[PDB]
Amino acid sequence: TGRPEWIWLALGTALMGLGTLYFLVKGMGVSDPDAKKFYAITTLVPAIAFTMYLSMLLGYGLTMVPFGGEQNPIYWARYADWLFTTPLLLLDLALLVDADQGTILALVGADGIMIGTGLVGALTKVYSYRFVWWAISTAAMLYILYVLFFGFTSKAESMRPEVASTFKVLRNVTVVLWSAYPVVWLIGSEGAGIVPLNIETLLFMVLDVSAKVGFGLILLRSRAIFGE
Amino acid sequence: TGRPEWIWLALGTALMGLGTLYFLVKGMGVSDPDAKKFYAITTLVPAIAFTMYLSMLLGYGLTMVPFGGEQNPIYWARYADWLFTTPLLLLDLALLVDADQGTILALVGADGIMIGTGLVGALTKVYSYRFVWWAISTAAMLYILYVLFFGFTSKAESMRPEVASTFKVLRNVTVVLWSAYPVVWLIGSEGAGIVPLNIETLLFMVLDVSAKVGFGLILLRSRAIFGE
Amino acid sequence: TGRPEWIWLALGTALMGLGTLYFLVKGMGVSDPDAKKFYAITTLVPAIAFTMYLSMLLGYGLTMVPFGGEQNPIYWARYADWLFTTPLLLLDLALLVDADQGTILALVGADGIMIGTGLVGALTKVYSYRFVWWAISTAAMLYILYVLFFGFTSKAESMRPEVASTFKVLRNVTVVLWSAYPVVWLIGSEGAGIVPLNIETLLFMVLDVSAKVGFGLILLRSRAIFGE
Ligand SMILES: *C\C=C(C)/C=C/C=C(C)/C=C/C1=C(C)CCCC1(C)C
Ligand SMILES: *C\C=C(C)/C=C/C=C(C)/C=C/C1=C(C)CCCC1(C)C
Ligand SMILES: *C\C=C(C)/C=C/C=C(C)/C=C/C1=C(C)CCCC1(C)C
């Protein structure tokens, strides 16, 4: 329920907090118009996650969901966090490659669908339906990753080499991390219940910090953010 | 309640699904910057409606509301769908006529008001208050339609003839379809109860498919989306 | 609960309504691209507040929250109103000073955090935690005000004198009004309970009208909105 995994919630909260502070301070030594944006976007991600992880720790971002004839504790704040941060991660990749607005809306819309349906499946009472949503959500994610490889990478190459290369790595990071989420939900308590809520929370905290601080450390330590 | 109108919910879900797939495939043969946007926007509308109609079918996008001394089943997901799609429909008309940002915000804000207040009235427990919201919502809609005729049409004429003409028809379609919604809510169970929830659901499914697939078919089969 | 402060709710609703109508009519005599935006943005703020104050009056935007071993009535619609209007107020200041997009996102993100966490603390059941949220929210507000003085004012001076001066006053107004909110929440029933819900509602209605109509009257009666 809400006791065993508090340590992961607390570690997550601390890591997001420290991460947000490191980016704030680091962003002071910046005045380049375009550099700001990457900093503004990359510092906001963990600021939000910080409040979301804190809300789960204190017990506000949690709710019980009845299914499989049981009362399962669902951390809805985990999805609320994802609803606002993933589209911002997509934006960094978008600015990085100079993506057209038409492409930006497509990704954001698919991203909102991905999270929105994942949340619906998290809260769904009927067992089998739960996986229908996990399937729709998963498709949106592949759609997103399909664009990042067949509508982004091809363009980054048409840009400065430092940008194409940084983007290439950030894209690669994204494929690995994002794809890891649906797998965790499927083996966890929200889905198949092959692993307890305790290890499910830990796994997502590891993934969230990696994507919300780790990914930030890579992008923000790159010259790909300045126009030279 | 949630049994009689399932056929309309299922037909709606299927029609939105097939519609989304047709636009995805059709959008592959497109690379024009501005063409993308119309495709990105027009394909996302039914993608979302699809998930919303599926959520109503499975019973997740439904809730019971007490009023008139009765327990009335309210499909809140129907409004959730509208909250995200109507502003996107407005965007197609906006891009189509090259509308200024000031005008775009006005329409979107009024649109969010229109749906937001319609939802409040859908969920309202006190009978008479329900119609106060229907009235505020309806005013926002006329405001929107007033701009599409006295702040849009006049400009489309100052653009390419194919655009002005396509916009003219799309505007005309919008007046007829949008205005049809408040009328349906008033005679339906959510409002006057002059017609059962069964026919209310059917009527809105017909309208939603028309606006989410039909309207798309018209816009996307037009040269008004390319810059020549 | 929901009876004593209805007069403030009704006065608030009326003032926001009349305010919205005054701006609509006033905005008709405007065609300047940039003038529209200030009008579009400044007229939408009270349009929304109007619906929010009306929802509190009728009793829809209210909910009871258990804490301190008591059932406290929380006007969640007050925060819902703030969630959409404050970012729009920030936009007026942003357009006014020609702020970069990177700076705009930072402010909006911090603003959404400020309100989001204030709402969490409003709804929080555990007494001490409530103030943790008030503290996080308050920090975001100072962050916002810190940017309006060390990332905005310095630029407005690099613009036309009428803009710099109007912005200077609008900034000054913002510092005074915004800072007044957290103080009210702390002494009110949602926080310390040093003053009844009756006076808490009155105080916020006074502040809301000032920021949603008052501030509008100042900005819209200024030439700082036209490009000359
Ligand atoms: C906070 C940062 C990131 C990158 C979060 C990413 C989350 C996902 C990619 C989540 C995906 C899901 C899928 C595809 C289907 C099951 C439900 C999830 C919401 C966990
Ligand atoms: C999904 C596509 C469209 C075009 C949906 C449009 C919906 C409306 C115009 C709804 C309007 C309403 C009004 C004006 C007042 C009563 C409540 C409604 C939300 C049904
Ligand atoms: C409607 C217009 C305005 C300017 C509203 C402003 C509201 C605030 C600045 C609210 C701030 C809060 C803080 C900083 C912390 C306690 C909770 C509040 C949400 C009241």
Short mmCIF file of C-alpha atoms in Angstrom, two decimals, chain B residues 17-182:
data_model
loop_
_atom_site.label_atom_id
_atom_site.label_comp_id
_atom_site.label_asym_id
_atom_site.label_seq_id
_atom_site.Cartn_x
_atom_site.Cartn_y
_atom_site.Cartn_z
CA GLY B 17 -10.76 4.34 -35.11
CA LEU B 18 -11.08 3.67 -38.81
CA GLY B 19 -11.05 7.41 -39.37
CA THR B 20 -7.78 7.86 -37.48
CA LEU B 21 -6.13 5.05 -39.47
CA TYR B 22 -7.26 6.49 -42.81
CA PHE B 23 -5.67 9.87 -41.97
CA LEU B 24 -2.42 8.36 -40.69
CA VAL B 25 -1.86 6.44 -43.92
CA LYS B 26 -3.00 9.40 -46.04
CA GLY B 27 -0.61 11.70 -44.18
CA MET B 28 2.44 9.66 -45.16
CA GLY B 29 2.40 10.99 -48.71
CA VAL B 30 2.93 14.50 -47.31
CA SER B 31 6.08 16.57 -46.71
CA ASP B 32 4.91 20.16 -47.22
CA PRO B 33 5.53 22.06 -43.91
CA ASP B 34 2.08 23.63 -43.87
CA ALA B 35 0.37 20.50 -45.19
CA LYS B 36 1.75 18.56 -42.21
CA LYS B 37 0.05 20.89 -39.72
CA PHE B 38 -3.42 20.39 -41.24
CA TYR B 39 -2.70 16.63 -41.22
CA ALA B 40 -1.22 16.61 -37.73
CA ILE B 41 -4.21 18.57 -36.40
CA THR B 42 -6.88 16.69 -38.40
CA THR B 43 -5.56 13.21 -37.53
CA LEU B 44 -5.26 13.95 -33.81
CA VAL B 45 -8.95 14.91 -33.42
CA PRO B 46 -10.32 11.42 -34.09
CA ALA B 47 -7.36 9.74 -32.37
CA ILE B 48 -8.54 11.41 -29.18
CA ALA B 49 -12.26 10.89 -29.85
CA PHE B 50 -11.44 7.24 -30.43
CA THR B 51 -9.99 6.88 -26.93
CA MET B 52 -12.89 8.88 -25.49
CA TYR B 53 -15.59 6.84 -27.23
CA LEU B 54 -13.79 3.66 -26.20
CA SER B 55 -13.74 4.86 -22.59
CA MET B 56 -17.52 5.48 -22.69
CA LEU B 57 -18.17 2.07 -24.24
CA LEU B 58 -16.21 0.21 -21.56
CA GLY B 59 -17.93 2.33 -18.94
CA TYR B 60 -14.97 4.35 -17.69
CA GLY B 61 -16.02 7.72 -19.12
CA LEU B 62 -19.37 7.64 -17.32
CA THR B 63 -20.63 8.85 -13.93
CA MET B 64 -24.05 9.14 -12.22
CA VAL B 65 -25.35 12.66 -11.39
CA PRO B 66 -28.25 13.27 -8.92
CA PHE B 67 -30.85 15.83 -10.04
CA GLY B 68 -34.59 16.20 -10.45
CA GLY B 69 -34.57 13.73 -7.59
CA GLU B 70 -33.06 11.05 -9.82
CA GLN B 71 -29.76 9.31 -10.55
CA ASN B 72 -28.84 10.37 -14.10
CA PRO B 73 -25.89 8.72 -15.99
CA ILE B 74 -23.60 11.47 -17.36
CA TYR B 75 -20.99 10.62 -20.00
CA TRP B 76 -18.33 13.08 -18.82
CA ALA B 77 -15.85 11.62 -21.32
CA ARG B 78 -18.04 13.11 -24.06
CA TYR B 79 -17.12 16.60 -22.76
CA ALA B 80 -13.51 15.57 -22.12
CA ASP B 81 -13.38 14.65 -25.81
CA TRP B 82 -14.88 18.03 -26.78
CA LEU B 83 -12.46 19.91 -24.51
CA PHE B 84 -9.49 18.82 -26.66
CA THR B 85 -10.95 18.48 -30.15
CA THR B 86 -12.97 21.64 -30.70
CA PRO B 87 -9.98 23.87 -30.11
CA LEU B 88 -8.11 21.83 -32.72
CA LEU B 89 -10.97 22.29 -35.22
CA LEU B 90 -10.73 26.03 -34.58
CA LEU B 91 -7.01 25.81 -35.30
CA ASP B 92 -7.60 24.30 -38.76
CA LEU B 93 -9.88 27.25 -39.56
CA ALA B 94 -7.28 29.57 -38.05
CA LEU B 95 -4.35 28.25 -40.10
CA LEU B 96 -6.61 28.13 -43.14
CA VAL B 97 -7.26 31.90 -42.87
CA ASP B 98 -3.89 32.98 -41.44
CA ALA B 99 -5.53 34.37 -38.27
CA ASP B 100 -3.53 36.56 -35.91
CA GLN B 101 -2.49 35.09 -32.56
CA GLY B 102 -4.69 37.56 -30.70
CA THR B 103 -7.72 36.13 -32.49
CA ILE B 104 -6.57 32.54 -31.93
CA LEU B 105 -6.35 32.97 -28.16
CA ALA B 106 -9.78 34.62 -28.02
CA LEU B 107 -11.41 31.65 -29.81
CA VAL B 108 -9.57 29.00 -27.80
CA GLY B 109 -10.38 30.74 -24.52
CA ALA B 110 -14.04 31.07 -25.47
CA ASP B 111 -14.01 27.45 -26.62
CA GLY B 112 -12.58 26.23 -23.31
CA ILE B 113 -15.27 28.27 -21.59
CA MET B 114 -18.01 26.82 -23.79
CA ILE B 115 -17.06 23.22 -23.00
CA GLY B 116 -16.05 23.83 -19.40
CA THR B 117 -19.42 25.41 -18.57
CA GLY B 118 -21.31 22.76 -20.54
CA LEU B 119 -19.58 20.15 -18.39
CA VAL B 120 -20.43 22.04 -15.18
CA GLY B 121 -24.10 22.07 -16.22
CA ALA B 122 -23.91 18.35 -17.05
CA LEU B 123 -22.67 17.59 -13.55
CA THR B 124 -24.78 20.20 -11.68
CA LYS B 125 -27.18 18.72 -9.03
CA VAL B 126 -29.70 21.56 -8.87
CA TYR B 127 -32.12 21.47 -11.83
CA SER B 128 -32.63 25.18 -12.66
CA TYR B 129 -28.93 26.04 -12.33
CA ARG B 130 -28.20 23.46 -15.01
CA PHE B 131 -29.77 25.75 -17.65
CA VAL B 132 -27.85 28.80 -16.42
CA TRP B 133 -24.66 27.01 -17.46
CA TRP B 134 -26.19 25.86 -20.79
CA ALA B 135 -26.90 29.56 -21.41
CA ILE B 136 -23.35 30.78 -20.61
CA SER B 137 -21.91 27.98 -22.73
CA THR B 138 -24.25 28.78 -25.61
CA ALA B 139 -23.18 32.44 -25.52
CA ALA B 140 -19.50 31.48 -25.84
CA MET B 141 -20.40 29.37 -28.88
CA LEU B 142 -22.16 32.28 -30.60
CA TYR B 143 -19.14 34.43 -29.74
CA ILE B 144 -16.99 31.83 -31.50
CA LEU B 145 -19.29 31.65 -34.52
CA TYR B 146 -19.49 35.45 -34.53
CA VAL B 147 -15.70 35.62 -34.96
CA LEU B 148 -15.69 32.94 -37.67
CA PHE B 149 -18.03 35.24 -39.69
CA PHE B 150 -17.00 38.74 -38.68
CA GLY B 151 -13.30 38.19 -38.05
CA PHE B 152 -12.35 35.25 -40.26
CA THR B 153 -14.43 35.09 -43.45
CA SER B 154 -13.60 38.72 -44.20
CA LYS B 155 -9.92 37.79 -44.15
CA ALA B 156 -10.11 34.49 -46.04
CA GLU B 157 -11.40 36.58 -48.95
CA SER B 158 -8.15 38.54 -48.78
CA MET B 159 -6.32 35.25 -49.43
CA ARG B 160 -6.13 32.71 -52.28
CA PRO B 161 -9.55 31.87 -53.79
CA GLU B 162 -9.23 28.13 -53.07
CA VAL B 163 -8.61 28.96 -49.41
CA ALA B 164 -11.45 31.48 -49.16
CA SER B 165 -13.81 29.00 -50.81
CA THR B 166 -12.72 25.98 -48.78
CA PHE B 167 -12.88 28.08 -45.63
CA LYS B 168 -16.31 29.37 -46.63
CA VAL B 169 -17.66 25.81 -46.80
CA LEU B 170 -15.83 24.65 -43.66
CA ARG B 171 -17.23 27.69 -41.84
CA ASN B 172 -20.72 26.86 -43.07
CA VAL B 173 -20.27 23.26 -41.91
CA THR B 174 -19.16 24.52 -38.50
CA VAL B 175 -22.20 26.77 -38.00
CA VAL B 176 -24.59 23.88 -38.70
CA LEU B 177 -22.79 21.20 -36.64
CA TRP B 178 -21.71 23.23 -33.60
CA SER B 179 -25.15 24.88 -33.17
CA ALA B 180 -26.68 21.39 -33.26
CA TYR B 181 -24.97 20.40 -30.00
CA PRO B 182 -26.67 22.78 -27.52
#
